[PDB]
Scaffold this active site. Sequence first.
Site, PDB file in Angstrom:
ATOM      1  N   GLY A  24       0.671  -1.303  -0.020  1.00  0.00           N
ATOM      2  CA  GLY A  24      -0.125  -0.251  -0.464  1.00  0.00           C
ATOM      3  C   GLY A  24       0.704   1.154   0.102  1.00  0.00           C
ATOM      4  O   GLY A  24       2.012   0.896  -0.301  1.00  0.00           O
ATOM      5  N   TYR A 100      -2.199 -17.662   5.815  1.00  0.00           N
ATOM      6  CA  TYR A 100      -1.866 -16.606   4.075  1.00  0.00           C
ATOM      7  C   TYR A 100      -2.380 -17.727   3.088  1.00  0.00           C
ATOM      8  O   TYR A 100      -3.602 -18.479   3.744  1.00  0.00           O
ATOM      9  CB  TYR A 100      -0.301 -17.345   4.434  1.00  0.00           C
ATOM     10  CG  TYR A 100      -0.206 -18.140   2.184  1.00  0.00           C
ATOM     11  CD1 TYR A 100       0.150 -16.793   1.088  1.00  0.00           C
ATOM     12  CD2 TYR A 100       0.289 -18.361   2.030  1.00  0.00           C
ATOM     13  CE1 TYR A 100       0.496 -16.898  -0.092  1.00  0.00           C
ATOM     14  CE2 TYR A 100       0.556 -19.084   0.620  1.00  0.00           C
ATOM     15  CZ  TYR A 100       1.236 -18.058  -0.150  1.00  0.00           C
ATOM     16  OH  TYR A 100       2.289 -18.349  -1.250  1.00  0.00           O
ATOM     17  N   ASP A 149     -15.666  -1.459   2.778  1.00  0.00           N
ATOM     18  CA  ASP A 149     -15.033  -1.659   1.535  1.00  0.00           C
ATOM     19  C   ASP A 149     -15.186  -3.030   1.153  1.00  0.00           C
ATOM     20  O   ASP A 149     -13.696  -3.486   0.692  1.00  0.00           O
ATOM     21  CB  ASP A 149     -13.242  -1.290   1.156  1.00  0.00           C
ATOM     22  CG  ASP A 149     -13.299  -1.105  -0.202  1.00  0.00           C
ATOM     23  OD1 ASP A 149     -14.067  -0.686  -0.828  1.00  0.00           O
ATOM     24  OD2 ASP A 149     -11.739  -1.201  -0.133  1.00  0.00           O
ATOM     25  N   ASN A 154     -11.280  -7.508  -1.700  1.00  0.00           N
ATOM     26  CA  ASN A 154     -11.089  -7.297  -0.658  1.00  0.00           C
ATOM     27  C   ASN A 154     -11.449  -8.687   0.450  1.00  0.00           C
ATOM     28  O   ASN A 154     -10.963  -9.435   1.714  1.00  0.00           O
ATOM     29  CB  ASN A 154     -11.403  -6.531   0.453  1.00  0.00           C
ATOM     30  CG  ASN A 154     -10.625  -5.717   0.039  1.00  0.00           C
ATOM     31  OD1 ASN A 154      -9.209  -5.233  -0.008  1.00  0.00           O
ATOM     32  ND2 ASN A 154     -11.517  -3.754  -0.095  1.00  0.00           N
ATOM     33  N   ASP A 167      -8.598  -7.050   5.518  1.00  0.00           N
ATOM     34  CA  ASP A 167      -8.561  -5.946   6.209  1.00  0.00           C
ATOM     35  C   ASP A 167      -9.792  -5.635   6.694  1.00  0.00           C
ATOM     36  O   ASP A 167      -9.957  -4.350   5.970  1.00  0.00           O
ATOM     37  CB  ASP A 167      -8.064  -4.851   4.832  1.00  0.00           C
ATOM     38  CG  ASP A 167      -7.190  -5.322   3.832  1.00  0.00           C
ATOM     39  OD1 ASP A 167      -6.733  -6.069   4.358  1.00  0.00           O
ATOM     40  OD2 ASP A 167      -6.796  -4.995   2.826  1.00  0.00           O
TER      41      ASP A 167
HETATM   42  C1  LIG Z   1      -7.400  -9.437   7.497  1.00  0.00           C
HETATM   43  O1  LIG Z   1      -6.392  -9.295   6.516  1.00  0.00           O
HETATM   44  C2  LIG Z   1      -5.524  -8.919   6.214  1.00  0.00           C
HETATM   45  C3  LIG Z   1      -4.423  -8.347   7.385  1.00  0.00           C
HETATM   46  C4  LIG Z   1      -3.564  -8.693   6.904  1.00  0.00           C
HETATM   47  O2  LIG Z   1      -2.293  -7.697   8.393  1.00  0.00           O
HETATM   48  C5  LIG Z   1      -3.138  -7.217   9.381  1.00  0.00           C
HETATM   49  C6  LIG Z   1      -2.889  -8.765   6.270  1.00  0.00           C
HETATM   50  C7  LIG Z   1      -3.739  -9.006   5.432  1.00  0.00           C
HETATM   51  N1  LIG Z   1      -3.402  -8.858   3.461  1.00  0.00           N
HETATM   52  C8  LIG Z   1      -3.206  -7.860   2.730  1.00  0.00           C
HETATM   53  C9  LIG Z   1      -4.612  -7.637   1.799  1.00  0.00           C
HETATM   54  N2  LIG Z   1      -4.719  -6.441   1.489  1.00  0.00           N
HETATM   55  C10 LIG Z   1      -5.309  -6.423   0.152  1.00  0.00           C
HETATM   56  C11 LIG Z   1      -5.903  -5.375  -0.701  1.00  0.00           C
HETATM   57  C12 LIG Z   1      -6.845  -7.066   0.372  1.00  0.00           C
HETATM   58  C13 LIG Z   1      -2.420  -9.952   3.122  1.00  0.00           C
HETATM   59  C14 LIG Z   1      -2.417 -11.376   3.430  1.00  0.00           C
HETATM   60  C15 LIG Z   1      -3.055 -13.052   2.978  1.00  0.00           C
HETATM   61  C16 LIG Z   1      -2.704 -12.358   2.030  1.00  0.00           C
HETATM   62  N3  LIG Z   1      -1.714 -13.627   1.390  1.00  0.00           N
HETATM   63  C17 LIG Z   1      -1.835 -14.238   0.118  1.00  0.00           C
HETATM   64  C18 LIG Z   1      -2.079 -12.997  -0.870  1.00  0.00           C
HETATM   65  C19 LIG Z   1      -1.140 -13.333  -2.426  1.00  0.00           C
HETATM   66  C20 LIG Z   1      -1.488 -14.151  -3.270  1.00  0.00           C
HETATM   67  N4  LIG Z   1      -1.192 -13.763  -3.983  1.00  0.00           N
HETATM   68  N5  LIG Z   1      -0.896 -12.229  -4.039  1.00  0.00           N
HETATM   69  C21 LIG Z   1      -1.273 -11.555  -5.252  1.00  0.00           C
HETATM   70  C22 LIG Z   1      -1.301 -12.174  -3.216  1.00  0.00           C
HETATM   71  N6  LIG Z   1      -2.436 -11.842  -0.529  1.00  0.00           N
HETATM   72  C23 LIG Z   1      -1.974 -11.404   1.369  1.00  0.00           C
HETATM   73  C24 LIG Z   1      -2.253 -10.611   1.803  1.00  0.00           C
HETATM   74  C25 LIG Z   1      -4.654  -9.331   4.975  1.00  0.00           C
END
Ligand SMILES: COc1cc(OC)cc(N(CCNC(C)C)c2ccc3ncc(-c4cnn(C)c4)nc3c2)c1
Length: 291
Positions: A24, A100, A149, A154, A167
Site C-alpha cells: 500500500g 496466508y 470496503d 478484499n 482488511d
Molecule cells: C485481515 O486481512 C489482512 C490483514 C493483514 O494484516 C493485518 C494483511 C492482509 N493482507 C493484505 C491484503 N490486502 C488486500 C488489498 C486485500 C494479506 C494477507 C494474506 C495474503 N495472502 C496471500 C496474498 C497473495 C497471494 N497472491 N497474491 C498476489 C497475493 N496476499 C495476502 C495479503 C490481510
Amino acid sequence: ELPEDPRWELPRDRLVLGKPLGEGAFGQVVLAEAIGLDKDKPNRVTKVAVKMLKSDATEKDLSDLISEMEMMKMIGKHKNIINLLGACTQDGPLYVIVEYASKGNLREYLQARRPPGEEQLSSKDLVSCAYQVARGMEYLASKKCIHRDLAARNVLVTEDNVMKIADFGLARDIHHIDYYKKTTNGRLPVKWMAPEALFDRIYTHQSDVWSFGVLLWEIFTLGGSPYPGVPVEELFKLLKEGHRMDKPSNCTNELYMMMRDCWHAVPSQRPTFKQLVEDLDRIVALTSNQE
Ligand SMILES: COc1cc(OC)cc(N(CCNC(C)C)c2ccc3ncc(-c4cnn(C)c4)nc3c2)c1
C-alpha cells in the site's frame, strides 16, 4: 514503545521472511515461514503472511497498524476471515502475522477461471463462493465490525479454495476519502458504496449488505468491472436516478433478486447477512455442479 502481549507474541527468530505479496502507501505484506507458531509442534513450519510498515512510515502509520492488529485480537477467529496468528512487537519493527491465502484475491481468482478466449467454476462453486463470503460477513457483523470496503478485491482465496474476508480491521478516516482515487487494477471503490455511505458518510451493516450485492454481481460476472468507463460524477447521477446494474448472463432470477434486494434504496429493507447466509445455504444445495 509497544506493550508486551504474551497471548500473541512470536520470537523474531521463528519467522523467516520471504517474497512480497502486496503493498500500500506506507504498509507492505510478505510471505513468511513461521517455525513452531503452535506450542506443539515447535518443529513444524507454517506459511503465513506478515504485514509491516514501509521504511517511510510515520507515527500515525504505526498507530494505524497497531489499531488494525488490536481490532483483529478483539474480533476473534472465523474460517471465512483472514485470521490473526501472532505478532513480533519487541526489539524491532512491528510484524503482524496473519493467514496466508495462496490463490490471492477473489477478483483475480474468478477472472483466471473464465472460459478461454485453472479449471472452470460450476454454478454450485459460484454460489458456494457467495455463501462463504456471506458467512464471514455474518461473523464480522456479529462481532460489531463494519467492513466499509467489501468487494471481491478484499476477499482472499486459500490453497483449499476457502474464501476469507481481508482488511476488516483496516484503519480508515471516512472524512478524508479521495473518491477519485483508483485501485491497483484501475477501478473506483465508490462503485461498491451504498448511497448513504457515499453521500452521507453513514456506514452500517446495511451499507456492507449493499456492497455484498455488488460483490455477488462480481461473482456471477466472473470478476466483471461494475459500471466500466463511468467516472465519479456520472456514478453520483446514476445512484440519484435509482439506476441498478443489469442481470448478468448465466445468473438465475433468484440470485439477481438477491442482488437487487441488497441494493434496496431503504437500508432497513435490505436483507441482513444472517438472512443472506440462510438463503445462500438453501440455494447452494439446489444448484447443479454439472455446468
Ligand atoms: C485481515 O486481512 C489482512 C490483514 C493483514 O494484516 C493485518 C494483511 C492482509 N493482507 C493484505 C491484503 N490486502 C488486500 C488489498 C486485500 C494479506 C494477507 C494474506 C495474503 N495472502 C496471500 C496474498 C497473495 C497471494 N497472491 N497474491 C498476489 C497475493 N496476499 C495476502 C495479503 C490481510
